[PDB]
């Protein structure tokens, strides 16, 4: 792993607070509480 | 006893005892069963304080967090002088409450 | 080495008499977490193997009759007899059994006669 | 616990205020 | 699980690094505290006995 | 009752080596820890050595340390001490004795040998 996983598992951080995305990956290696966003996914254009 | 050689070849039910450094004269303690711990009346004196069992997982309360350069979330500016940020007021009279944080310039 | 020291280095008393045995050590012998005197008194008779007396400077064995009377605490220590008795003539020690103050020491040791 | 508590309340309405209602 | 020679000399240097107080959990087999290994065995340590393993 | 019964007595010429027996029975010889202590003629008694049976650990006096080795044998439960370069200062009686240790904590010398004397 890398990024903010790749340092959280390296001991080097204690808890990951940023806008992270639930997915099944992490629930396995990782821990989470309740999430405090609720949204999806979408496109952006320009006009 | 029963002697019974496992399929290590091992014989097993095998009785232990427990022994205790009480200022460096050996002390029964316990025993162990063939799959139980039997302690005696002898007191569990340990190094340090009480004789019940110390909780040796400490704790922390100081936390590193880590956090990402996210636009509407976490935001990034050099410091005025040393250190220091400026006190920037809201339109609502809300001081903006910023922290120092440590991080690369760049990739 | 903790200096024991004991106090007559000998004595003479009628049958039916009250005496007394002092232990001094260099040292306090008392362990302050479990606030117990690490010495020990003792009978030695010619001809045979001291004999347990009194342990801790204030319980008697089982076999000690209750007219010996240990006392004292830290450094000084005393070993008194209520009644003495002709048996009772023997060449008394007080000995340390600290562990942490090792090696094992004994006093001067207290002749007594009748 | 402390994050429910936090939502239960209208305190995601003010951090909302802050910065998210807010429009340029 | 050592031998006495690596249990004494590990003995020996936590003593100097004082890691004996309050709170350690301590935990060693039968082969770690006899010889000279026992003579640096810090007080309040916890052993196992073999029983009728050499009569 | 527990019984500990040493060897006779030894006429050695100075600077040989003795080795003194001292059988024990009657107690736990495994899970007890027996002493030798010097004591010549008119003197005190001075501690030379402890042994462990169940784990063969050694301490000897720094006095005797290179001078008086212990081995012990579990099939006879009999310690040893085996006294080398010995000098006239060696002339002086030699006693096994087992410790009464109670509930978990010594109490003192509980069991005691005949005595043997080196000459």
Redesign the interface.
């Known amino acids: 792993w890398n990024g903010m996983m790749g340092e959280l598992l390296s001991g080097q951080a204690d808890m990951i607070v940023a806008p992270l995305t639930i997915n099944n990956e992490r629930a396995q290696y990782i821990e989470f509480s309740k999430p405090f966003k609720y949204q999806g996914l979408t496109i952006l254009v320009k006009k | 006893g029963r002697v019974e050689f496992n399929e290590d070849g091992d014989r097993k039910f095998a009785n232990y005892s427990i022994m205790?450094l009480?200022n460096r004269?050996?002390?029964?303690?316990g025993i162990y069963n063939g799959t139980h711990v039997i302690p005696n009346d002898?007191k569990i004196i340990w190094p340090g304080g009480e004789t019940e069992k110390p909780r040796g997982y400490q704790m922390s309360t100081r936390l590193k967090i880590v956090t990402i350069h996210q636009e509407p979330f976490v935001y990034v500016k050099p410091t005025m002088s040393d250190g220091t940020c400026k006190e920037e007021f809201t339109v609502n009279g809300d001081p903006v409450k910023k922290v120092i944080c440590t991080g690369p310039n760049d990739t | 080495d903790i200096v024991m020291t004991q106090s007559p280095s000998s004595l003479a008393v009628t049958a039916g008499e009250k005496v007394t045995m002092r232990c001094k050590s260099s040292q306090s012998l008392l362990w302050s977490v479990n606030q117990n005197n690490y010495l020990?008194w003792?009978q030695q008779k010619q001809g045979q193997?001291?004999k347990?007396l009194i342990?801790?400077a204030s319980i008697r064995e089982s076999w000690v009759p209750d007219r010996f009377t240990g006392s004292g605490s830290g450094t000084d220590f005393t070993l008194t007899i209520s009644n003495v008795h002709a048996e009772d003539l023997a060449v008394y020690?007080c000995?340390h059994?600290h562990?942490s103050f090792l090696?094992?020491?004994?006093g001067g040791?207290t002749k007594l006669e009748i | 616990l402390s994050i429910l508590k936090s939502h239960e309340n209208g305190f995601m309405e003010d951090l909302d205020k802050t910065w998210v209602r807010y429009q340029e | 699980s050592a031998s006495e020679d690596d249990a004494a000399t590990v003995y020996r240097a936590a003593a100097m690094l004082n890691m004996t107080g309050s709170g350690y959990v301590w935990l060693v087999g039968?082969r770690e505290?006899?010889?000279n290994a026992?003579?640096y065995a810090p007080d309040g340590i916890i052993g196992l006995?073999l029983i009728n393993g050499?009569? | 009752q527990g019984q500990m019964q040493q060897s006779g007595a030894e006429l050695v010429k100075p600077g040989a080596s003795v080795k003194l027996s001292c059988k024990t029975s009657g107690f736990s010889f495994?899970?007890s820890?027996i002493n030798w202590l010097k004591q010549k003629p008119g003197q005190?008694?001075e501690?030379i050595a402890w042994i462990?049976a169940?784990?063969?650990?050694?301490?000897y006096?720094q006095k005797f340390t290179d001078k008086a080795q212990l081995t012990v044998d579990?099939?006879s439960s009999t310690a040893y001490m085996q006294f080398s370069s010995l000098t006239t200062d060696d002339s002086a009686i030699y006693?096994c004795?087992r410790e009464?240790?109670y509930?978990?904590?010594?109490?003192?010398?509980?069991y005691?040998?005949?005595?043997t004397l080196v000459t």
Not at chain 3, 103 to 106: H, L, W
């Open positions: 205790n009480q004269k050996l002390v029964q303690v002898r | 020990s003792y193997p001291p347990l342990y801790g020690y000995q059994n562990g090696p094992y020491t004994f040791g | 039968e505290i006899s010889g026992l003579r006995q050499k009569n | 495994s899970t820890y005190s008694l501690w462990y169940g784990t063969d650990g050694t301490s006096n579990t099939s006693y004795a009464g240790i509930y978990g904590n010594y109490a003192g010398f509980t005691w040998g005949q005595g």
